[PDB]
Every structure is written in structure tokens, then in C-alpha cells.
Amino acid sequence: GKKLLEAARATDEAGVTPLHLAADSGHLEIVEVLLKTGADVNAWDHYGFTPLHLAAHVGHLEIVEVLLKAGADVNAQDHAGWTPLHLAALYGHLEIVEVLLKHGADVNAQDMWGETPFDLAIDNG
Amino acid sequence: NRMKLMIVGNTGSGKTLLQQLMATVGIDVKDWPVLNVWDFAGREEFYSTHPHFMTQRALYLAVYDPWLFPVILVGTIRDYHFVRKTIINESLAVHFLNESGVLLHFQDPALQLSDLYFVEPKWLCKIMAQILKGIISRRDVEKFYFKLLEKFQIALPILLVPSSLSDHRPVIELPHCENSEIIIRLYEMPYFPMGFWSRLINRLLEISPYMLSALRPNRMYWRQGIYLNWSPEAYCLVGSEVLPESFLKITVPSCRKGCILLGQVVDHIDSLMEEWFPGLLETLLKKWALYSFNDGEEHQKILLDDLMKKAEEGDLLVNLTIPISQIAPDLILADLPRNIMLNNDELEFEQAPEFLLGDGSFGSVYRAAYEGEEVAVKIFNKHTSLRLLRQELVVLCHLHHPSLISLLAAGIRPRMLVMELASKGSLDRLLQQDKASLTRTLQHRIALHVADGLRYLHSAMIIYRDLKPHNVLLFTLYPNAAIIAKIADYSIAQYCCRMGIKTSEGTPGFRAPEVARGNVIYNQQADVYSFGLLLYDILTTGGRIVFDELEIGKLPDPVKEYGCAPWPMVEKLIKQCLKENPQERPTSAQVFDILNSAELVCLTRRILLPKNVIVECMVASIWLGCGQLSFLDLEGYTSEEVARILCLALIVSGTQSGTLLVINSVTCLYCLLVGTADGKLAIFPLKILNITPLMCLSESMWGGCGTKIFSFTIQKLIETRTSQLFSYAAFSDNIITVVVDTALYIAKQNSPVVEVWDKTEKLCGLIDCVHFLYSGRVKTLCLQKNTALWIGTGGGHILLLDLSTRRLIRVIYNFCNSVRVMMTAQLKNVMLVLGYNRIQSCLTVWDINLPHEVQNLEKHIEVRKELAEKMR
Ligand SMILES: C[C@@H]1CN(c2cc(-c3n[nH]c4ccc(OC5(C)CC5)cc34)ncn2)C[C@H](C)O1
Ligand SMILES: Nc1nc2c(ncn2[C@@H]2O[C@H](COP(=O)(O)OP(=O)(O)O)[C@@H](O)[C@H]2O)c(=O)[nH]1
């Protein structure tokens, strides 16, 4: 049964993988043991997010490094056409912004509204 | 100065004559100085397509050792010769080029090739003839374009290729060989027009599935006949026979199905002759009925006109006696469904001017009573024929729709055509007299029902051609009724197969531009322009009616000219229906689909702000935001710099600096309440309730500062970050809006989840805006009183969710690109939606009854669908 999702919190209808919850909740050990188990690092849910997206959204740079060493997608588009650069520059995560641009980040990515990461960095400090 | 010169004649005549003037396949086109000759082929296989290449500017030479249906005759009628000087003596932008002969082009919508000009017309004539036991498949001739083959009656899609078929008629031994067992109808013509048999065969193998009922019969062809066969008791043998004239013989069994088939076949033959060979009906054509008093002698013939005169009085033929219903069951309507049969003893009517209901250009409709109920009777004029009544009954029978008028009984003795009575009259009288009862719901329902009737008529291979408010009848003025508007007056309704229609009929001022041309072969798309005109009239009420020149289309905008309230998505539909190109117009089904939407009904206004203007807030005359302040008159834009500006509340403004001003970083103003980015809650400075950024405030006192819900003096500091157990912690961790009716509907920054909280201070559920659904992140929340919850997403979607069952009512399509701020205002309660188009600001006004109208429209459509199913 699907009784492992709650363990990482403390798939589904949306399509949430326990790696997503581990990355979002701030747990790095669960992420590390899930990568060894052979999970999916580029799994998209109904919201279109990937573990890197949530990791950039919360602001855990260590988890960002762990998922960037496993071979994730540095530039992935969710349902809104957003990449981890937008989420990192929207919440003032300068360290995550710097770490993202070292693995091949697209700094000129246009979302479905047409904005680039620089636009969100300038509109929110 | 140049013109054509056709050399026509039978095969082998010598058309060896053109060369001296200076077996061919198709048409030979040359040049002869000035005169571009057109040598025709005398072989019978090309005769079907020969008429398509005959014009009036030419100098036809008839070469002899049909065509005539400035001609001079030469042997091998302005002159006569036997075998160059006589030809010269006797001979003395895109459309004009076709007549000259430089290139060929057909602008008629029926052939659907008005965007293809081909030079070298001689190539087309040769190509049309290289394809010709005539029967082939597509792959057979691909290895030796197929839109011209079926459009010239040369290769019908079944590919029949009616030409080159076996001239030898087979030995068809029908059942019921006795005289009292078959009905024989004879058409006598001096000659068969070119392409007549091909056109007749094409028409007959298109109505065969629907000639009896949809069941397909067995079919045979021999290029001058066709045998349709459903059973030993239901067949039809239409073919050519000989006795110095040309005879078309129709044989059917003398039973109910045989009579039905004979009626259908004679109706279709008559319509074919009227549409494509009017010369025979100007009489050259004689129609006979074959009868025998006993079943042992040769048939005798009586003209159909004499038989009609005899059937005018009594239904019996006397010498020995035969009933007319077994000789010509089409004169007396014996082939009709026989449920609509007159009962003259049961009909009472007087035909007085006080009982007149209207006119139909061929008869007058009167008030009457039939079987004890009020009805409408269309007495046909004395200068009419049975053909008009039969072609009206073509539509009034076999077609039953909730948007089409219903027939009850028809007679031949007075030619009466009793119909049903509209309870509220016609739409023309309502537009011109009852201007106050035309609510928006009634207008939309009338348009919807007319569109439904047009769609059904077009689906039934019928073109209406006369769509005016006079022909639209109202059965009730109550908007929530299944039947409101109906279509009548099928006098000029004619069959429209995949061959087009040539005759131009329609009332001036209510017809498509092509029909008014009078020289084009048009199709069912001519009714879409009429429907667009009708929609324009309904929107403008009286309007242009209370003319023809400027509608063929230079009509003004409905709103400014007649001062009618704006109706977006209706003006757009009018514009795309009033198109000069029939192919660009939507079909009747597409028009019905466009009208069948509650977004069309409930969108009251749509105001476009100047480009590159960004709005942050607005209050209701609607004051706008942006340091810069604006104002709008719900149209007029006034803007000036005063300080950006974040919140407005009347007029008190708030800037992201801490300075609040009144004109005769603050984040929330409510009514006075002030919410800054630090957490303080001012009262207007009576007190300060400092608590990060306070951005929400509601009362039904509630609000939210950061990720926590308060109440006020702060009552309940309901912390709401503790919800990461459900949905992402990223979504769980600032509140965008707070909305409360019984629970606390909370939207958060970039969170597609609308949290629900009890006011037990505990979570009660999650609403996923992406599950119902392109960015699903919630921007705005709005409440309608015990009706629905309005959610404005990051995209242009508005989700209407039921307050009780949390079920989706409708997702409003992308009117604009991003819902910024939404509120309900008093304009008539409306919902004010401010959107973006990234940068074009976008203001939309919606009727507050959008969910109710969605439900009402879907229920109405389902009810009408069940009614339409029950009709048949
Ligand atoms: C006001 C008055 C007028 N009335 C009508 C009724 C009709 C009408 N009914 N059924 C029809 C069937 C055919 C028909 O063919 C037209 C469109 C050729 C006139 C009219 C009616 N057409 C005008 N007015 C009904 C009474 C109660 O009310
Ligand atoms: N002996 C003779 N033969 C003729 C005369 N006129 C025409 N022909 C023949 O008739 C044929 C005419 O064929 P033509 O009419 O051009 O074929 P079509 O265009 O398909 O009808 C030629 O092959 C000639 O040999 C004539 O005056 N005398």
C-alpha cells in the first residue's frame, strides 16, 4: 500500500512521490536513502513540480546540491512554465541562485507570462 | 476585341473543317486571328460536361453531316451553309477574363474552389476527359484533382463515372408484372438535355437511404436508368424507353411503399428540372399517367394536367372505374404519412381579413379551428400549382424539430396546409411593438432556437433562404421555457445536395450577398448571413427594420447607432456571421455551439484599458490604481501622478512608503482599516493593533497577517502554517485573501490550494484549483451569497465551485491572461474582474447569476435534446 508518503512527510491523486515530500519538508537523509533505493528525480505531479522545484521553493541549498549531484533537470517547466531559477529568485535565495547557474541553468527562460528570472528578482528584491 | 467561337456537332461531322478555316478528346482550344476557337467533341461521353463550357459571347457553329438547349449552321440559326467570309461577317477583372477565355475560374461557393485560379483553360478540358462498363476506384485512376471530378458530374463518390456505362439495358424482370400491380409515370421530352441522366442518377444515389424511411437499397445503373430495390414490395425502376421523342419511365409497385417511392422520385425529378433544366418547364415536357381499367389490355395514357383537373373534383376516374390514388398517388397526397390528412368536416374556417395572420408570397395564413383547437391555415392562391404545395410539404413532412413549425393535416381540394398556431405571434411584431418584454434571456433563447432550427434544416439537406423576424414565431414570452421561437414559411425551401443551388430567392434586406448577385451557385451558407442579420435585429430590437443596398455588408456597429446595451460575444458572432466570404462564415451547427454558452449571456461589459498600463487595485464610476492614480466611468480614462499605490478604499489611497492620503508600506484598506507590511492594524488614529505583512480583511471581522488568521482586541489568532501534513509545506507556509461564510476559505501566495478552516480553529479540507483545471495558483477569492465561490487563478480561468458540495460549476475560459483583482460591485449586481494580457490591462464585468445561468442553460439544452428525440 501507499503508506510511505506519510513517512517522508513526518504516488497519490496529485501524483506526489515521497522524494517530493522529503525535499519539501527539509529532510536530506530521506532524500539520500531514496536516491540509493532508485527513485525518480524527474517525476512530475499534477502541479508539474519536480523535487528540485520544491527544494528551490523552500530554500534548502543542501537538498539542492544533493538533487543536483543525482543528475536532475536544472531547467524544468511546470504547469505554469516555471523553472527553479524563478522560484529561487522569487524568495531571495541567493545561494540557490548561484548554485543553480553552475550546472547549466538557463538564465533567459521565459514562462507562460513571458517573464525571465531577472524580472522576478527585480520585482521582489 | 476578341471572343470565342464554338464548333459543335455530332462525332465524325467534320469539326477537318476548323483546320481548313485556319476524334478529339474533351475540347480543343486554339487561336485563330482574335477568335479563340473551341472545338467540341461529338462523342457522347463528353456531352455531360459540355454544357459547363458554353458561354454567350461565342459564335457557335453547328456542324452536321441538344446543343441548342449568334448560332449559324454549316453542313459537311442566323445563317445556313454547306462545305470563312460568313464567319467574319456574322461575328460583327477576374470575372471578365473568364468570358474572354484567357483563364477559367469559378467563384460559386458550391464548388468550393474560389481561391484557385488556373491559367490555360484548354488543359482543364483535356484533363476532365482523360478519365473516359463504367466503374472505377480511386487507386485505379491515381496511377492512370478528385474535387473537380465529383464537381462536374463526371465521377460520383459511391467512383461511379456515369459516362461510359453499359448502354445495353439488362433484362430486369420485376415482380408484380400485372397492370393492377404497378404504377407507371411517363415523362416525354423532345430530347434529353446534356448531363440530364448523369445529374438524375447522381441525385437518386444520394437520397436512397432516406427515400423510404435510413436503409440502403440495391442499385443498378446503365447510363440511362437506375433500379433501386428495397424489397419485392418496395422498388423503383427509373429508366429511358422508346415507342420519335425521348421518354423517361418510372415504375413502382402499386402499394403503400411504391406510392411513397413514386412521390419521392417525381418530387426529386421535378426539383432537378426546375433547378438545372428550366427550359423544359417553360410546354416542351409532357407528363403522362398510365392506367388500365382491366388487368388484360395495353396501358392508356392521360396527361397529368387533365388528371389533376379530374382529381380536383372527386378521387375517382370514370370511363369501368379506377381510383386516382393508384394511377397518380402524387396528385392527391396519397403517398403522404397519412396521419397529416385533412378532415374537412372537422375543419372550420372562414378566410376573413380579421382572421388573417400574415402572408407567404404564395398564400395567406389565417386563424382557424381544426379538431376543436386554434390552428393556422395557409390558403394557397388561385395562381398556384400542386408543385408549390408539394415542395412545402417536402419540409413540413419527414422533418420534426422543436424549432420548426409543426404541420397537422393537409388538403388538395382547397390546398389548405393547416399548421399550428403560435401563441404570441411573430418576432417582427414583438420587435416593432412589444419593446419592453425583450429581456436578455429572451433574446438569447430566441437566437438559440432559431440557430437550432437552422442547424436541423441544414443537416436535413434543406436550405431555408428566407430568414426574417416575420418568419420567426413566438410561442411564449416566458424565458425558462423549452419552446419559445420557431421557424415557418418553407415556401422557397429547396433540396440542397452536394451540387449547389442556382435560383436566387429571398426577401431583399435579409439575404446573403451572393444570392443577391443572382448569377452564382450558392449553398446552405447563405442562411448564416440571414441569421447574422436576425441577430443584429434582435440585439438592436427595432433597429434597421424600422436597406438592401448596404447589407450586400456595410452595416454600422449595433451599440453606437441604436444605443443598445453592449453584448460581447454576440457582437463578435454577428461580425463573423456577416462575412462576404461564405467559407469564412461559421456553419449553423457552429453558430448554435457559439450561442450555447452562459459566458455569452452573462458577460455584461469588457473594457480595454490603454496599453502598457498596470493596475494594482480598484474600487467602485470605478476608481483605478497603478505613484499614479486613475479613474474609470463604467468609458473614460483620467490618470495623473499623485505620489506605487497598493490599496484603495473610498477615496483613501495607500502607497508602499507609509504615506496615506485622501483625495476628494500600506497593503490593505477596508471599510477605516489600515494594514501595513509590518503587521500593524490601524483604525481611522483611534488605536493600533500591531502584531509579517497584513494583506487580508473580511467580515460576514476576519483577516490574515502572514501565515496566521486573527479576528477582532484580537480574538482568535488561528495559526495556519501547521498544515504541511496536507499538500506541500511550500504551499502551507502568506495569505492572499480571507473569505468566510461559515468556514474560513484561505488563499495563499502562489498556492493552488484554497484551505478551508473552521471557526474549532482546525482545517476542514483542501481545494485544488489545478485538479478542476494554465497556472492554477490562486490570485483572488470571492463569495456569492449561498451560491458559489469565485476563484481567480494565475491564468485567465475563473472557477465556480458550489458552496455546499464543493463541485465545479464551470471554468470560465481565458477571456484574458491573468486575473489580478476580482470584486463584486453595484452597477444590477455584477462581479468586477480585472485581468492582464501579458501588457494590456483588462476589465470585465460579469452578471452575478453566472452559475445559475450555466445550470439553466445546460438543463434547457438537455430538455430540448430530449424533445427533439421524442419528436422523431
Ligand atoms: C398576435 C396574434 C398573431 N398570431 C400569429 C400567428 C402566426 C402563426 N401562427 N402559426 C403560424 C404558422 C405559420 C405562419 O406563417 C407565417 C410565418 C407566414 C406567416 C404563421 C403562423 N403568425 C403571426 N401571428 C397568433 C395570435 C394568437 O396572435
Ligand atoms: N471524304 C470526306 N471525309 C470527310 C469530309 N469531312 C470530314 N471528313 C472525315 O470526317 C472526319 C472528321 O472528324 P472530326 O469531326 O474532326 O472528329 P470529332 O471532332 O471528334 O467530331 C475526318 O477524319 C475526315 O476524314 C468530307 O467532306 N469528305
Author numbering:
A (entry chain B): 17 to 26, 45 to 159
B (entry chain A): 1333 to 1347, 1349 to 1355, 1367 to 1377, 1389 to 1420, 1433 to 1436, 1446 to 1452, 1482 to 1488, 1501 to 1509, ...
Cite, word for word, the article reporting this structure.
Mutations in leucine-rich repeat kinase 2 (LRRK2) are one of the most common drivers of the familial form of Parkinson’s disease (PD) (1–3) and are also associated with increased risk for the sporadic form of PD. LRRK2 is a large, 2527-residue multidomain protein. Its N-terminal half is composed of armadillo (ARM), ankyrin (ANK), and leucine-rich (LRR) repeat domains, while its C-terminal half contains two catalytic domains, a guanosine triphosphatase (GTPase) (Ras of complex or ROC) and a Ser/Thr kinase, as well as two architectural domains, a C-terminal of ROC (COR) between the GTPase and the kinase and a WD40 domain at the end. We present cryo-EM structures of LRRK2RCKW, WT, and carrying the PD-linked mutations G2019S and I2020T, bound to the LRRK2-specific type I inhibitor MLi-2 or the broad-spectrum type II inhibitor GZD-824.
G2019S is the most frequently identified LRRK2 mutation in patients with PD. MLi-2 bound as expected in the adenosine 5′-triphosphate (ATP)–binding pocket of LRRK2’s kinase, with its indazole group making hydrogen bonds with the backbones of E1948 and A1950 in the kinase hinge region, as recently proposed based on molecular dynamics simulations. In contrast to those simulations, however, the glycine-rich (G) loop was extended in our structure, as expected for an active kinase domain, and F1890, located at the tip of the G-loop, was not involved in coordinating MLi-2. Also as expected, MLi-2 binding stabilized the DYG “in” and αC “in” conformation, a fully formed R-spine, and an ordered activation loop. Although the three structures—WT, G2019S, and I2020T—were very similar, two features were unique to LRRK2RCKW(G2019S):MLi-2. First, the presence of a Ser instead of a Gly at position 2019 introduced a clash with the G-loop that pushed S1889 away from S2019. The second was an unexplained density we observed in the LRRK2RCKW(WT):MLi-2 and LRRK2RCKW(I2020T):MLi-2 cryo-EM maps, but not in that of LRRK2RCKW(G2019S):MLi-2. Given the absence of density for this rotamer in G2019S, we predicted weaker binding of MLi-2 to LRRK2’s kinase carrying the G2019S mutation. Although the accurate determination of sub-nanomolar inhibitor affinities for complex proteins is challenging, our DSF assay showed that the addition of MLi-2 to LRRK2KW(G2019S) resulted in less thermal stabilization than that observed with LRRK2KW(WT). Our results raise the possibility that IC50’s measured using full-length LRRK2 (in vitro, in cells, or in vivo) may be a combination of IC50’s for at least two different populations: One population corresponds to the autoinhibited LRRK2, where the kinase cannot reach its fully active-like state, represented by our LRRK2(I2020T):MLi-2 structure, while the other population corresponds to activated LRRK2, where the repeats have undocked and the kinase can reach its active-like state, represented by our LRRK2RCKW(G2019S):MLi-2 structure.
